[PDB]
């Protein structure tokens, strides 16, 4: 064994135990060492090396490596993988940022390929931070095999399931309306438009719609919108309100019977009224003809009409509303847009073609007055969405898109997630299953220039598909050469055309690229490049036994990696999902860059370690629990956990190698109740630790790991130190030793997985090996003693008591008392066990066990003048309460009930009594749930001299120490100091010989280049010197 420094900081210790892991290649090793075990396999979100790693992948590579450290442990072998997710919006937008360029016209003008390539400039920038971040973290995985998203391989099994998908036909071109900015051209989150209200002021019209063969009848309908009205497909009407004929002088409307008084302008009368139903079918005249619609132009029926608002009759546009475009569809009606990307009218409106939609309101109303079609017009004062980013107003807008119809499998979805175990429970039917349960269609394409192509050509003559699974499917349909070589990126692939299967004609791909969402859902198949190789590697590593990532996720990973498994194997590609809480400051604030509240996990790791940051990131909390972060939270770890232990190895290694103690020989054994009590404390940690652990459990199984390290030091250390400092090696010296080491190396072993530098530390240094090589340890049944568990902690009470006691009075513990004294009930406890422990720890000359009070208090009894309601004699209860008292009192007390006799009766008293034990004099009481004691603070001069006598051997230890002297050399002492402090020592001096290491110990008037140091708050001057 090495020697300890206890006080070699964190980050000396933890790059000497990286050197040790590089130096026997422990990672690896821990790996083929499992060859033939069964397989456990996880798999990680990929991150992004454009950005620092932070302390949500500090949490989440924590849990991850936790988890695989343990597995591997208890009999798996756990391959590890990472990846980097590297195409993805936000860095075409930093590369647009940098270059100071957007929009189509400029990215060609700068040309597409050098776009490309700055693109893949800046997604590893930040590489050689992750690296140092990974392995200071101790999280293992090889980082020179990564997957990484831009890679052709991986780019190609990601078409391989895409062309997949497409073979079933659940890959199709559509529309979806959306809040829409037309000036920056793009869709703005429910956030972002709740960002960007204002108050405006336009029109609201009612429109006519003329019945066909019908004299001078009309649908009326009321819209906020007239710009939609070129593009009517439809009238919707409720199939179950109450419609009315209403006429007006030489007309007929029909509007809803409920709104017809608000409706229509001055008075009509009621031809006729007709259910919703009842119109259903009912030919019209739109208000502009140039639009084709080839299907429409009727009323329908739809559930969502109301008889709150418009005329009961609504105009249906089905590219500029969600509720339009659904029911448009739903009865087979033509879909139909007349804007531009840019909310323009097309050349479908010729009089308004090219100008921005919003703008025509006023040209169209004027339109439809002068053709008789507005029945009225008001002002309207409401609040309008606004882009906050250049505040254009936005506009409900389909644009066309590529979908993967993923509702054709929403039962499959809903059949995998239940085979998922959700952490916590409530997710899987609550934020997962709900969002499952009101799936869409999954938008896949995005028009941008960085990402995976989307691999669908289209002839140009008869619109045929063809989506190319590989590259050589994609060179074997090609009309002209393509090389082996070719990059399966923008704008590589969109200079490669196909020869049509149907007619021989020119295809040419789809100019968009696919959601990031499904290149990272994707990496089950595309991490190995399945299925072009790695078959058997594949399939042992899917599906994951479990994945590790935040709960934000729910609409993210953890649903693009249920999705493209579902579409692709029909199969669930993860068992469990352990769901994690995004970090907070100490304030309870989510960290984030805007905020600047985030700290970071390398500054945490180089002040406290990776060590005492992993625990933090484990302990007192769920990962699903948001945890409010600060340094102070890593400290307490580092203290309480890593500090705690640190310190009782280092005192073992001391001490073991001072007395020569060494595991391999036999010695003579007797262990005493503190052996059995650790050992039996230590067993049933292992026990409920791997409880915890095979559950998931990290929380609960730290929480009973530090109960155990505390009860280590404080206790079972504490108590035993004197059995390390004897002289020889008599058989409860070698107990200790025995025990000790028993306990640090299973110890190490349960740590392993949590604090994995120090737990090496411990177990390499003890061993020889490294132990993470190790199998996690089994409970010991024959060490459980549960008896001795609940003694000691009754002990443990009783100490906290008196400890308790003497604190009240600021009576240190070095100042002997004369006596602590225990009253219990119950012959529980073989208190005479434990007394030398309890004298020991409380420094108390004489440990009493009582059954009675007599000696130590005395009773005062009043009467409860609250109980004692219905006694009207409070002039004899208080003459009857008022030696003789003495033994009236204590026969009340135990007795439980109390006889006295007033002027002339007597009555019988029981819980109408108030009882005060009175300490007698020189005494101090405390108790709690069974137990009282009592502590005899009266000091005496021989007590007081003999805490002197203490204070002056602790002075000594200390002063050794601050001279690093080693603890069994023997000194020549000089030592100056008051007339107190020279007659405690004098009167001590065989407590002095016995308790410190002594050539010699001379009381001296003056000292010569002495030191002056504190014994309490004497000042006494020390020297140590040599002398022949
Ligand atoms: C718990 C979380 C954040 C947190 O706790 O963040 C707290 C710290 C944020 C502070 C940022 C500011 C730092 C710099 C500054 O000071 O300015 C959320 C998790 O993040 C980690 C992982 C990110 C992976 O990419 C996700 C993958 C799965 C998907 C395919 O994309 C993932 O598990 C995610 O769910
Ligand atoms: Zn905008
Ligand atoms: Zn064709």
């Given at each position: 064994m090495k020697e300890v420094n206890v006080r070699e900081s964190s980050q000396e210790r933890e790059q000497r135990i990286q050197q040790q892991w590089q130096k026997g290649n422990v990672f690896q090793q821990s790996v083929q060492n499992r060859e033939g075990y069964p397989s456990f396999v996880f798999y990680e979100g990929p991150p992004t090396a454009n950005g620092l790693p932070h302390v949500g992948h500090a949490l989440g590579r924590t849990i991850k490596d936790v988890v695989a450290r343990y597995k591997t442990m208890t009999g798996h072998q756990v391959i590890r993988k990472a990846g980097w997710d590297t195409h993805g919006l936000p860095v075409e937008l930093g590369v647009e940022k940098q270059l100071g360029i957007s929009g189509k016209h400029d990215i060609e003008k700068y040309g597409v390929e050098a776009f490309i390539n700055k693109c893949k400039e800046s997604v590893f920038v930040y590489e050689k931070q992750w690296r140092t971040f990974t392995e200071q973290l101790g999280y293992?995985?090889?980082?020179?095999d990564p997957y990484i998203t831009l890679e052709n391989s991986y780019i190609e099994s990601v078409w391989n399931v895409l062309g997949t998908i497409h073979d079933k036909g659940l890959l199709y071109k559509g529309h979806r309306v959306s809040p829409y900015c037309p000036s920056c051209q793009t869709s703005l989150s429910s956030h972002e438009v709740a960002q960007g209200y204002k108050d405006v002021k336009d029109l609201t019209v009612t429109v006519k719609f003329k019945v066909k063969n019908r004299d001078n009848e009309y649908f009326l309908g009321w819209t906020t919108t007239p710009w939609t009205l070129p593009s009517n497909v439809a009238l919707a009407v409720h199939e179950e309100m109450s419609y009315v004929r209403a006429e007006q002088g030489d007309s007929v409307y029909i509007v809803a019977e409920a709104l017809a008084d608000k409706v229509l302008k001055g008075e009509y009368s009621v031809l006729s009224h007709h259910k919703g139903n009842e119109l259903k079918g009912m030919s019209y005249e739109p208000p502009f003809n140039f639009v084709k619609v080839e299907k429409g132009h009727e009323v329908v029926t739809a559930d969502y009409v109301t008889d709150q608002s418009g005329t009961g009759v609504v105009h249906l546009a089905p590219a500029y509303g969600e509720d339009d475009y659904r029911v448009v569809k739903e009865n087979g009606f033509s879909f139909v847009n007349v804007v531009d990307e840019k909310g323009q009218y097309t050349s479908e409106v010729p009089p308004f073609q090219g100008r921005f939609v919003k703008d025509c309101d006023v040209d169209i109303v004027r339109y439809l007055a002068n053709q008789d079609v507005l029945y009225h017009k008001e002002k309207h004062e409401h609040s309008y969405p606004f882009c906050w980013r250049c505040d254009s107003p936005l506009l409900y807008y389909a644009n066309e898109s590529w979908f993967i119809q993923t509702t054709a499998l929403k039962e499959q979805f809903l059949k995998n997630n239940e085979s998922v175990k959700w952490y916590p429970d409530h997710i899987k039917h609550g934020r997962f299953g709900k969002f499952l349960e009101n799936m869409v269609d999954w938008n896949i394409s995005r028009?941008?220039?960085?990402?995976?192509?989307?691999?669908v050509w289209e002839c140009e003559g008869c619109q045929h598909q063809v989506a190319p699974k590989s590259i050589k499917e994609l060179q074997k349909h090609a009309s002209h050469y393509v090389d082996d070589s070719i990059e399966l990126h923008k704008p590589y692939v969109d200079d490669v055309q196909l020869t049509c299967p149907v007619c021989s004609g020119e295809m040419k791909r789809t100019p968009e690229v696919i959601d990031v969402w499904f290149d990272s859902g994707s990496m089950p198949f595309a991490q190995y490049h399945y299925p072009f190789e790695n078959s058997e590697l594949f399939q042992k590593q899917f599906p994951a036994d479990v994945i590790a990532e935040g709960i934000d996720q729910t609409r993210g990973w953890f649903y693009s990696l249920m999705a493209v498994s579902t579409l692709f194997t029909g199969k669930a590609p993860y068992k469990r999902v352990l769901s994690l809480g995004h970090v907070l400051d100490e304030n309870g604030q989510k960290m984030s860059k805007s905020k600047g509240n985030a700290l970071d996990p390398v500054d945490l790791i180089h002040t406290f370690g990776a060590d005492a940051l992993r625990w933090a990131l484990l302990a007192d909390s769920a990962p699903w629990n948001p945890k409010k972060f600060s340094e102070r939270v890593v400290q307490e770890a580092k203290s309480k956990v890593i500090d705690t232990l640190v310190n009782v190895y280092g005192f073992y290694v001391l001490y073991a190698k001072l007395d020569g103690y060494d595991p391999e020989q036999t010695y003579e054994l007797k262990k005493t109740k503190l052996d059995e009590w650790i050992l039996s404390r230590l067993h049933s940690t292992v026990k409920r630790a791997t409880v915890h652990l095979e559950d998931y459990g990290f929380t609960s199984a730290a929480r009973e790991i530090a109960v155990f390290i505390e009860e280590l030091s404080n206790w079972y250390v504490r108590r035993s130190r004197d059995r390390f400092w004897s002289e020889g090696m008599d058989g409860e010296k070698a107990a200790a030793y025995d025990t000790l080491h028993e306990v640090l190396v299973t110890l190490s072993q349960l740590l392993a997985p949590f604090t994995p530098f120090v737990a090496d530390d411990v177990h390499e240094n003890l061993?020889?090996?490294?132990?993470?090589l190790a199998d996690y340890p089994a409970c010991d049944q024959t060490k459980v003693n549960e008896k001795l568990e609940k003694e000691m902690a009754a002990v443990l009470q009783v100490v906290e008591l008196g400890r308790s006691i003497r604190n009240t009075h600021s009576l240190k513990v070095k100042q002997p008392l004369q006596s602590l004294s225990l009253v219990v009930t119950e012959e529980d406890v073989e208190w005479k066990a434990y007394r030398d422990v309890i004298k020991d720890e409380l420094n108390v000359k004489n440990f009493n066990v009582e059954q009675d009070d007599d000696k130590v208090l005395s009773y005062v009894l009043k009467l409860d003048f609250k109980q004692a309601?219905?006694?009207?004699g409070k002039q004899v209860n208080e003459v009857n309460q008022a030696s003789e008292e003495k033994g009236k009192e204590f026969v009340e007390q135990g007795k439980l009930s109390v006889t006295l006799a007033s002027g002339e009766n007597l009555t019988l008293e029981t819980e109408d009594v108030l009882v005060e034990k009175v300490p007698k004099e020189g005494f101090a009481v405390a108790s709690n749930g069974m137990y009282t004691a009592v502590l005899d603070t009266a000091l005496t001069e021989e007590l007081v001299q003999e805490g002197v006598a203490r204070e002056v051997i602790r002075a000594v230890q200390d002063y050794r120490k601050k001279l690093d002297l080693p603890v069994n050399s023997r000194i020549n002492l000089e030592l100056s100091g008051d007339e107190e402090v020279q007659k405690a020592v004098a009167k001590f001096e065989t407590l002095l010989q016995e308790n410190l290491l002594l050539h010699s110990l001379s009381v001296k008037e003056t000292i010569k280049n002495g030191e002056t140091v504190k014994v309490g708050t004497k000042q006494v001057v020390l020297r140590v010197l040599n002398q022949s």
């Open positions: 293992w995985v090889d980082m020179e028009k941008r220039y960085w990402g995976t192509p989307l691999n061993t020889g090996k490294s132990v993470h309601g219905p006694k009207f």
